[PDB]
Design a protein around this ligand. Structure first.
Ligand SMILES: [Mg+2]
Ligand SMILES: [Mg+2]
Ligand SMILES: [Mg+2]
Ligand SMILES: [Mg+2]
Ligand SMILES: [Mg+2]
Ligand SMILES: [Mg+2]
Ligand SMILES: [Mg+2]
Ligand SMILES: [Mg+2]
Ligand SMILES: [Mg+2]
Ligand SMILES: [Mg+2]
Ligand SMILES: [Mg+2]
Lengths: 195, 175, 175, 139
RNA sequence: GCUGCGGGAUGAACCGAACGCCGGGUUAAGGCGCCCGAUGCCGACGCUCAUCAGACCCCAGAAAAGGUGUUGGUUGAUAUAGACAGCAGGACGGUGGCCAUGGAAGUCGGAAUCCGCUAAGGAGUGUGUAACAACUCACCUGCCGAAUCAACUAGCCCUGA
């Protein structure tokens, strides 16, 4: 049904390719932590390209024409727009199925975030090559919302730390129960039939 | 030549036609590397036409044979002589390759001359192939592969592009 | 018999060659178009058996960029005669399907049956012209694995040229 | 860090290719990418295989440089890699994956009913352990 | 022109291939990250960092020239009769030689060109004080310790743009 994707350590083009392919099949995919999406190349190079993209505007009326978003979620959404056939009623429905969020929303705090392996920085890039943060690019150009998003992100990371101790305590309790007696009769059958 | 796939070593011998002006042609011999024996025969006609007064009509090929490796299980060192033609002018070249068989070493030679110097197979002419021993290699790369008790790990080994599912909670640790 | 004495040996250059036409129809010079009309290659992907001769090889050297020609093996002859054997009485190409058609229309030379027809095609006898005229040009489908670039010769990794034994692989892909 | 590395005389595992599930032994490195591997008792023939094609292990042997099949087999039977290789958790994990590939429907039914019974016992005993933890924390 | 169809995004000429209506299979030209059918092969080798990368005949832009930016190649020359760089010391005598005098006492210029001490000094590679003098270099020696230096050439990238 719904898919929740991490954005930490992912590449823009690879993640946009996989999302734009899997959204045409009907799986309602949502990319969360969009400010953490890495972009290969030098950061001055990437903001020079984005400054040229901002320079692209209609001279007769800048409103009626090229819209230029600064938030990284809307940057990724424009990247998926430029790849889906949005002028027809297939890519428009796919963009309606796609949702994008900066930071992490409260339902996506609870719902588990997937990590796509083929779109990873570590898999796709040599580690001696330069990179750039889309959130750093957005804070440098236009998107003035890093002081709120980073604060709420550290708040939910503290919430995750206060949940993980309880989860690890419950895991230690259930492994103490597995260390305890009178479960092995089914475990012999399980090991002989693929534990 | 296309040099498609791995190369093969062919011993091709050829001679002139029996003529009343000169019977018993000297039956020359070459060592042609080619993907198959038809390309070996044609490149043999090319080289013998450039060397001596021979063409396909006034000559014939006596024998064309596959040459198998004398020791495929031995990691050997091969020096290759090259008469490639660059964009400005042709040049002579000596290269070295550590590989198992002669056909594989000349295959690596064609692939590497296509990689670095942008030389097509139209321009590369293999002058001579010779197995060279240790302590005669001019190249520092092969000279530093010459190590007994050699130790190296495999740092940052990433693999399996989407053989695993495209969507997971994993985050693959390298090495 | 020659390697026990230490001497080489050359086999007989064969006198029969299968010719498939590779290239298209429009954009063809008349110098090669007339030779294709004489070799009955008027459409694309049709093939004929040609008795090799100096005049025939000098025709094939004219139409090298348009055909692929080689030496068919015994199954390469046999599958083309059995599977797609189409003769003609005067007009009206009929599938062979019986020995009576060959015994009635062609069997005026002791060649009444299909074993005689395959023998006359493979071992080129004195009545090869009647058998080649009786056989309609073999309509062949496109190959399974595809073709290599269709423009350069088989020496340069292409299709339009001489290959001398890989026409067996080509006829197993096409037939 | 870097506890494992290729070496003259190290056994290794093969993941990709026609020899998947077969142990090789590295003899010497050809050039940076492929190694002359050999198999004494694991049915794989002496050839050249890539380093990304193979998988590094932890057991070593004492091979001479560019040795033969006979001396590789003698060092293999001296080191006893087969029983020592079966006596690890790694081979048990690979064996469990092969047994999961060799499951059947009746086996999955038995696994699922034992899974229901074990999960009920786990649920009740973890609830009893946390009840005992609250009873310990109450004073 | 008189000509549809598949690629070149878009096209009169380009590359395949020519057209009655359809079912199945196969292929050319081309392509396989998404639009957009197909590499989601545990593809192989090597090159490339651009602060203006590059991406396929016609085809929609660019040269001469340059780079101690990296990758090969050629020609050579040095180095246990201890080099290359680094630190330290010497760098004279004939002779302020000779053509000059506005100076030349190596140092604007013209012609040349040896010997001794030698550890080694070039009748001197430059900086200067107008010149006379100080400084420095070739060359030599002390420590160090084993590879070093020079000129061309062509692949990518950069400047030229
Ligand atoms: Mg054409
Ligand atoms: Mg198929
Ligand atoms: Mg043409
Ligand atoms: Mg016309
Ligand atoms: Mg078109
Ligand atoms: Mg175009
Ligand atoms: Mg069809
Ligand atoms: Mg093609
Ligand atoms: Mg697709
Ligand atoms: Mg350069
Ligand atoms: Mg440029």
């Amino acid at each position: 049904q719904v898919l929740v994707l991490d954005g930490r350590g992912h590449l823009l083009g690879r993640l946009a390719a996989i999302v734009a392919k899997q959204v045409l099949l009907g799986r309602k995919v949502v990319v969360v932590r969009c400010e953490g999406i890495n972009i290969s190349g030098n950061f001055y190079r990437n903001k020079l390209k984005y400054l040229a993209f901002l320079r692209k505007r209609m001279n007769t009326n800048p409103s009626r024409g090229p819209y230029h978003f600064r938030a990284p979620s809307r940057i990724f959404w424009r990247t998926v727009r430029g790849m889906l056939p949005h002028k027809t009623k297939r890519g428009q429905a796919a963009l309606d199925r796609l949702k994008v969020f900066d930071g992490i929303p409260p339902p996506y705090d609870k719902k588990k975030r997937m990590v796509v392996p083929a779109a990873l920085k570590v898999v796709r890039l040599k580690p001696t090559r330069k990179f750039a943060y889309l959130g750093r690019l957005a804070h440098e150009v236009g998107w003035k919302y890093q002081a709120v998003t980073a604060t709420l992100e550290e708040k939910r990371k503290e919430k995750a730390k206060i949940h993980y101790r309880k989860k690890k305590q419950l895991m230690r309790l259930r492994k103490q129960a597995e260390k305890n007696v009178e479960k092995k009769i089914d475990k012999y059958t399980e090991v002989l039939k693929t534990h | 030549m296309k040099a498609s796939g791995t190369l093969r070593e062919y011993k091709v011998v050829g001679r002139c036609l029996p003529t009343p002006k000169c019977h018993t042609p000297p039956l020359y011999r070459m060592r042609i590397f080619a993907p198959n024996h038809v390309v070996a025969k044609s490149r043999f006609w090319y080289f013998v036409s450039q060397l001596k007064k021979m063409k396909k009509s006034s000559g014939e090929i006596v024998y064309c044979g596959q040459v198998f490796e004398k020791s495929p299980l031995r990691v050997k060192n091969f020096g290759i002589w090259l008469r490639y033609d660059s964009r400005s002018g042709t040049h002579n070249m000596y290269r070295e390759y550590r590989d198992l068989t002669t056909a594989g070493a000349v295959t690596q030679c064609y692939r590497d001359m296509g990689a670095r110097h942008r030389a097509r197979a139209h321009s590369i002419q293999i002058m001579k192939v010779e197995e060279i021993a240790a302590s005669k290699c001019r190249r520092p790369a092969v000279k530093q592969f010459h190590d007994s008790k050699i130790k190296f790990p495999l740092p940052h080994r990433v693999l399996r592009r989407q053989h695993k599912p495209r969507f997971t909670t994993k985050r693959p640790n390298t090495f | 018999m020659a390697r026990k004495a230490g001497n080489f040996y050359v086999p007989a250059e064969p006198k029969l060659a299968f010719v498939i036409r590779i290239r298209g129809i429009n954009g063809v010079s008349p110098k090669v178009r007339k030779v294709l009309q004489l070799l009955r290659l008027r459409q694309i992907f049709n093939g004929t058996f040609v008795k090799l001769n100096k005049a025939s090889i000098n025709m094939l050297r004219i139409v090298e960029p348009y055909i692929a020609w080689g030496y068919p093996n015994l199954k390469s002859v046999n599958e083309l005669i059995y599977k797609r054997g189409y003769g003609k009485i005067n007009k009206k190409r009929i599938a062979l399907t019986d020995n009576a058609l060959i015994a009635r229309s062609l069997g005026k030379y002791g060649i009444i049956c299909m074993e005689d027809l395959i023998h006359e095609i493979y071992t080129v006898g004195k009545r090869f012209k009647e058998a080649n005229n009786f056989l309609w040009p073999f309509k062949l489908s496109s190959p399974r694995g595809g073709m290599k670039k269709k423009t350069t010769h088989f020496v340069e990794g292409g299709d339009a040229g001489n290959r001398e034994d890989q026409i067996n692989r080509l006829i197993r892909r096409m037939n | 860090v870097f506890r494992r590395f290729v070496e003259v005389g190290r056994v290794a595992y093969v993941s990709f290719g026609p020899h998947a599930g077969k142990l090789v032994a590295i003899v010497d490195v050809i050039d940076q990418n492929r190694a002359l591997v050999d198999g004494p008792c694991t049915q794989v023939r002496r050839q050249a295989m890539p380093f990304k094609c193979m998988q590094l292990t932890d057991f070593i042997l004492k091979f001479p440089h560019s040795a033969h099949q006979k001396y590789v087999r003698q060092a293999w039977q001296k080191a006893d890699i087969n029983t020592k290789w079966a006596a690890t958790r790694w081979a048990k994990k690979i064996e469990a994956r092969e047994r999961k590939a060799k499951m059947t429907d009746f086996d999955r039914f038995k696994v699922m009913k034992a899974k229901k019974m074990r999960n009920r016992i786990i649920k009740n005993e973890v609830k009893k352990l946390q009840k005992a933890a609250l009873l310990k924390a109450s004073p």
